RNA sequence: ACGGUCGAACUUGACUAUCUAGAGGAAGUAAAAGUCGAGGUUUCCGUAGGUGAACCUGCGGAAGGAUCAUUAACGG
Protein backbone atom coordinates (compact mmCIF):
# COMPACT_ATOMS: atom_id res chain seq x y z
CA UNK A 1 0.00 0.00 0.00
CA UNK A 2 1.36 3.38 -1.10
CA UNK A 3 0.84 6.42 1.10
CA UNK A 4 0.98 10.17 0.42
CA UNK A 5 0.82 12.99 2.97
CA UNK A 6 0.54 16.69 2.12
CA UNK A 7 0.66 19.49 4.74
CA UNK A 8 -2.05 22.16 4.90
CA UNK A 9 -1.40 25.70 6.17
CA UNK A 10 -3.73 27.49 8.56
CA UNK A 11 -5.12 29.89 5.95
CA UNK A 12 -5.93 26.93 3.67
CA UNK A 13 -7.99 25.10 6.32
CA UNK A 14 -11.35 26.83 5.83
CA UNK A 15 -11.27 26.50 1.98
CA UNK A 16 -10.42 22.84 2.56
CA UNK A 17 -13.59 22.60 4.65
CA UNK A 18 -15.86 24.36 2.16
CA UNK A 19 -14.53 22.40 -0.85
CA UNK A 20 -14.04 18.96 0.72
CA UNK A 21 -16.97 17.36 -1.13
CA UNK A 22 -15.67 18.13 -4.64
CA UNK A 23 -12.27 16.97 -3.42
CA UNK A 24 -13.06 13.45 -2.32
CA UNK A 25 -15.78 12.70 -4.89
CA UNK A 26 -13.32 12.83 -7.86
CA UNK A 27 -10.89 10.64 -5.91
CA UNK A 28 -13.04 7.75 -4.66
CA UNK A 29 -15.52 7.51 -7.55
CA UNK A 30 -13.68 7.48 -10.88
CA UNK A 31 -10.12 7.31 -9.54
CA UNK A 32 -10.48 5.01 -6.53
CA UNK A 33 -8.21 5.95 -3.63
CA UNK A 34 -8.59 6.38 0.12
CA UNK A 35 -8.79 9.94 1.46
CA UNK A 36 -8.69 11.45 4.90
CA UNK A 37 -7.79 14.68 6.68
CA UNK A 38 -5.27 13.88 9.43
CA UNK A 39 -6.59 16.47 11.84
CA UNK A 40 -3.93 16.18 14.55
CA UNK A 41 -0.96 16.83 12.25
CA UNK A 42 -3.10 18.75 9.69
CA UNK A 43 -2.15 16.60 6.73
CA UNK A 44 -3.99 15.22 3.71
CA UNK A 45 -3.67 11.43 3.62
CA UNK A 46 -3.81 9.38 0.41
CA UNK A 47 -3.75 5.59 0.46
CA UNK A 48 -4.28 2.81 -2.04
CA UNK A 49 -6.93 0.09 -1.76
CA UNK A 50 -7.81 -3.12 -3.58
CA UNK A 51 -9.81 -0.98 -6.04
CA UNK A 52 -6.81 0.74 -7.65
CA UNK A 53 -5.78 0.61 -11.29
CA UNK A 54 -3.65 3.04 -13.35
CA UNK A 55 -1.24 3.64 -10.47
CA UNK A 56 0.10 6.93 -11.88
CA UNK A 57 -3.23 8.57 -10.99
CA UNK A 58 -2.10 8.00 -7.40
CA UNK A 59 0.71 10.51 -7.93
CA UNK A 60 -1.71 12.68 -9.91
CA UNK A 61 -4.13 12.60 -6.98
CA UNK A 62 -1.41 13.99 -4.71
CA UNK A 63 -0.71 16.87 -7.09
CA UNK A 64 -4.50 17.32 -7.23
CA UNK A 65 -4.84 18.40 -3.64
CA UNK A 66 -1.40 20.03 -3.72
CA UNK A 67 -2.80 22.47 -6.27
CA UNK A 68 -5.62 23.26 -3.86
CA UNK A 69 -3.00 23.85 -1.18
CA UNK A 70 -1.15 26.34 -3.37
CA UNK A 71 -4.22 28.52 -3.87
CA UNK A 72 -5.67 27.10 -7.07
CA UNK A 73 -9.38 26.55 -7.56
CA UNK A 74 -10.98 23.13 -7.40
CA UNK A 75 -11.75 22.87 -11.13
CA UNK A 76 -8.14 23.58 -12.10
CA UNK A 77 -7.09 20.76 -9.79
CA UNK A 78 -9.65 18.59 -11.60
CA UNK A 79 -7.80 19.67 -14.74
CA UNK A 80 -4.70 18.14 -13.15
CA UNK A 81 -6.75 14.97 -12.65
CA UNK A 82 -8.22 14.70 -16.16
CA UNK A 83 -5.24 15.73 -18.26
CA UNK A 84 -1.96 13.82 -18.38
CA UNK A 85 0.54 16.62 -19.14
CA UNK A 86 -0.27 19.54 -16.83
CA UNK A 87 2.45 21.01 -14.63
CA UNK A 88 3.17 23.49 -11.84
CA UNK A 89 5.96 26.05 -12.09
CA UNK A 90 6.67 28.35 -9.18
CA UNK A 91 9.01 31.27 -8.59
CA UNK A 92 9.27 34.29 -6.32
CA UNK A 93 8.93 37.84 -7.63
CA UNK A 94 12.30 38.69 -6.10
CA UNK A 95 13.92 35.60 -7.68
CA UNK A 96 14.18 37.54 -10.95
CA UNK A 97 14.84 41.09 -9.66
CA UNK A 98 15.59 42.56 -6.23
CA UNK A 99 12.58 44.69 -5.32
CA UNK A 100 12.12 45.91 -1.76
CA UNK A 101 9.19 47.55 -0.04
CA UNK A 102 6.62 49.43 -2.06
CA UNK A 103 8.27 48.46 -5.36
CA UNK A 104 7.48 44.80 -4.63
CA UNK A 105 3.83 45.63 -3.99
CA UNK A 106 3.72 47.65 -7.20
CA UNK A 107 5.14 44.64 -9.08
CA UNK A 108 2.35 42.54 -7.56
CA UNK A 109 -0.17 45.12 -8.76
CA UNK A 110 1.27 45.03 -12.27
CA UNK A 111 0.91 41.25 -12.39
CA UNK A 112 -2.64 41.43 -11.08
CA UNK A 113 -3.75 44.57 -12.89
CA UNK A 114 -6.79 46.66 -12.04
CA UNK A 115 -9.75 44.45 -11.19
CA UNK A 116 -7.51 41.45 -11.74
CA UNK A 117 -8.10 41.93 -15.47
CA UNK A 118 -4.46 41.81 -16.59
CA UNK A 119 -3.86 38.53 -14.78
CA UNK A 120 -7.23 37.29 -16.06
CA UNK A 121 -6.25 38.17 -19.62
CA UNK A 122 -3.12 36.04 -19.50
CA UNK A 123 -5.12 32.90 -18.69
CA UNK A 124 -7.41 33.49 -21.68
CA UNK A 125 -4.24 34.00 -23.68
CA UNK A 126 -2.11 31.19 -22.38
CA UNK A 127 -4.62 28.53 -21.18
CA UNK A 128 -2.76 28.46 -17.85
CA UNK A 129 -3.78 29.40 -14.33
CA UNK A 130 -1.91 31.77 -12.02
CA UNK A 131 -1.83 32.02 -8.22
CA UNK A 132 -0.42 35.24 -6.77
CA UNK A 133 0.67 34.51 -3.21
CA UNK A 134 2.35 37.04 -0.92
CA UNK A 135 5.66 36.87 -2.83
CA UNK A 136 5.39 33.56 -4.71
CA UNK A 137 3.86 33.10 -8.16
CA UNK A 138 2.48 29.72 -9.25
CA UNK A 139 1.69 28.83 -12.87
CA UNK A 140 -0.36 25.81 -13.95
CA UNK A 141 -0.26 24.55 -17.52
CA UNK A 142 1.68 22.78 -20.23
CA UNK A 143 5.37 23.49 -20.67
CA UNK A 144 5.15 25.93 -23.59
CA UNK A 145 2.17 27.66 -21.99
CA UNK A 146 4.12 27.88 -18.72
CA UNK A 147 7.03 29.43 -20.64
CA UNK A 148 4.77 31.97 -22.35
CA UNK A 149 2.94 33.01 -19.17
CA UNK A 150 6.24 33.18 -17.27
CA UNK A 151 7.73 35.49 -19.91
CA UNK A 152 4.62 37.68 -19.79
CA UNK A 153 4.86 37.89 -15.98
CA UNK A 154 8.60 38.62 -16.01
CA UNK A 155 8.09 41.45 -18.49
CA UNK A 156 5.21 42.75 -16.37
CA UNK A 157 7.60 43.07 -13.43
CA UNK A 158 10.58 44.40 -15.43
CA UNK A 159 8.74 47.71 -15.46
CA UNK A 160 7.01 47.33 -18.81
CA UNK A 161 3.54 48.93 -18.83
CA UNK A 162 0.67 46.44 -18.55
CA UNK A 163 -0.88 47.82 -21.74
CA UNK A 164 2.17 46.88 -23.82
CA UNK A 165 2.26 43.42 -22.25
CA UNK A 166 -1.48 43.09 -22.96
CA UNK A 167 -1.04 43.89 -26.64
CA UNK A 168 2.05 41.76 -27.20
CA UNK A 169 0.60 38.79 -25.32
CA UNK A 170 -2.52 38.97 -27.48
CA UNK A 171 -0.21 38.99 -30.51
CA UNK A 172 2.09 36.09 -29.48
CA UNK A 173 -0.91 33.86 -28.63
CA UNK A 174 -1.47 33.10 -32.34
CA UNK A 175 1.38 30.63 -32.81
C1' A B 1 61.56 144.65 -3.59
C1' C B 2 62.54 140.37 0.75
C1' G B 3 59.06 137.47 3.34
C1' G B 4 54.37 135.23 4.86
C1' U B 5 49.34 133.77 3.62
C1' C B 6 45.05 132.35 0.45
C1' G B 7 45.52 130.10 -3.99
C1' A B 8 43.77 129.34 -9.30
C1' A B 9 46.68 126.96 -12.68
C1' C B 10 51.20 124.49 -15.01
C1' U B 11 55.02 120.24 -15.48
C1' U B 12 56.40 115.27 -14.47
C1' G B 13 55.27 110.18 -12.84
C1' A B 14 51.33 106.33 -10.95
C1' C B 15 45.95 104.59 -10.44
C1' U B 16 41.79 105.40 -13.18
C1' A B 17 37.74 106.70 -16.76
C1' U B 18 36.20 108.88 -21.34
C1' C B 19 36.46 110.66 -26.48
C1' U B 20 38.46 109.70 -31.01
C1' A B 21 42.18 107.32 -35.28
C1' G B 22 43.14 102.51 -35.86
C1' A B 23 46.58 97.80 -39.15
C1' G B 24 45.17 93.15 -37.77
C1' G B 25 41.66 89.05 -35.66
C1' A B 26 37.71 86.09 -34.20
C1' A B 27 31.45 85.45 -34.79
C1' G B 28 26.47 85.91 -37.00
C1' U B 29 23.33 87.08 -41.30
C1' A B 30 22.12 87.19 -46.89
C1' A B 31 23.86 85.88 -51.87
C1' A B 32 27.15 80.25 -54.07
C1' A B 33 21.55 73.57 -55.70
C1' G B 34 29.84 74.99 -57.22
C1' U B 35 33.11 70.33 -54.10
C1' C B 36 33.25 65.70 -51.37
C1' G B 37 30.11 61.35 -48.71
C1' A B 38 19.67 57.83 -36.36
C1' G B 39 16.15 56.77 -32.75
C1' G B 40 13.18 56.86 -27.62
C1' U B 41 8.12 55.39 -26.37
C1' U B 42 7.59 53.27 -17.84
C1' U B 43 9.31 57.97 -15.92
C1' C B 44 13.18 59.68 -13.09
C1' C B 45 17.21 61.33 -8.84
C1' G B 46 22.48 61.28 -6.99
C1' U B 47 27.14 59.47 -8.54
C1' A B 48 31.14 56.95 -11.79
C1' G B 49 32.56 54.94 -16.56
C1' G B 50 31.85 54.12 -21.86
C1' U B 51 34.78 59.62 -27.07
C1' G B 52 32.09 66.03 -25.62
C1' A B 53 26.54 65.86 -26.08
C1' A B 54 23.16 61.95 -26.71
C1' C B 55 22.10 57.33 -24.97
C1' C B 56 23.96 52.78 -22.61
C1' U B 57 26.00 50.56 -18.09
C1' G B 58 27.53 49.46 -12.35
C1' C B 59 25.57 50.96 -7.03
C1' G B 60 21.90 53.32 -3.93
C1' G B 61 17.08 55.82 -3.73
C1' A B 62 11.71 57.39 -5.61
C1' A B 63 6.38 56.69 -7.82
C1' G B 64 5.40 61.56 -9.81
C1' G B 65 3.56 53.25 -12.12
C1' A B 66 -2.77 49.47 -13.09
C1' U B 67 -4.13 44.91 -5.81
C1' C B 68 -6.80 39.99 -8.31
C1' A B 69 -7.75 35.63 -4.71
C1' U B 70 -7.20 32.83 0.12
C1' U B 71 -6.65 34.82 4.88
C1' A B 72 -9.08 34.53 13.79
C1' A B 73 -10.08 29.47 16.25
C1' C B 74 -11.87 24.73 15.16
C1' G B 75 -4.10 20.00 16.48
C1' G B 76 -1.32 21.45 21.01
Experimental determination approach used: cryo-EM
**Is the same domain home to A93 and A42?**
no
Q: Which residues pair with A18 in a beta bridge?
A: none
Look at chain A and report how many structural domains it folds into: 2
Does A53 share its domain with A111? no
For A147, the domain range is 83-175
Packing angle, helices A162-172 and A117-126, rounded to 10 = 10
- Give yes or no: residues A88 and A77 share one domain: no
Which one-letter DSSP state was computed for residue A94? Answer: G
Which residues have CB atoms below 7 Å from chain B, the nucleic strand? Answer: A 10-15, 17, 39-42, 71, 98, 100-103, 105-106, 108-110, 112-120, 132-134, 159-164, 166
Question: Is A148 exposed, middle or buried, given 0-12, 13-18 or 19+ CB atoms closer than 10 A?
Answer: buried
- CA A24 to chain CA mean position, Å: 19
The C1' atom of B12 and the CA atom of A136 lie apart, in whole Å, by 97
Distance of alpha carbon A145 from alpha carbon A70, whole angstroms: 19
How far, in whole angstroms, is CA A49 from its chain's centroid?
Answer: 28
Q: A48, A82, A116: which is the final residue of a domain? A: A82
Same domain, yes or no: A14 and A49: yes
Is A43 in the same domain as A102? Answer: no
Task: Judge if A94 and A158 occupy the same domain.
Answer: yes
DSSP E strand stretches across chain A: 3-7, 34-38, 43-47, 87-92, 129-132, 136-141
Amino acid sequence: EETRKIPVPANRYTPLKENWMKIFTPIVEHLGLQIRFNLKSRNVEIRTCKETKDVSALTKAADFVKAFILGFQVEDALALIRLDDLFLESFEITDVKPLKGDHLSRAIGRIAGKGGKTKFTIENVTRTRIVLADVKVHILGSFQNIKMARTAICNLILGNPPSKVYGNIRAVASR
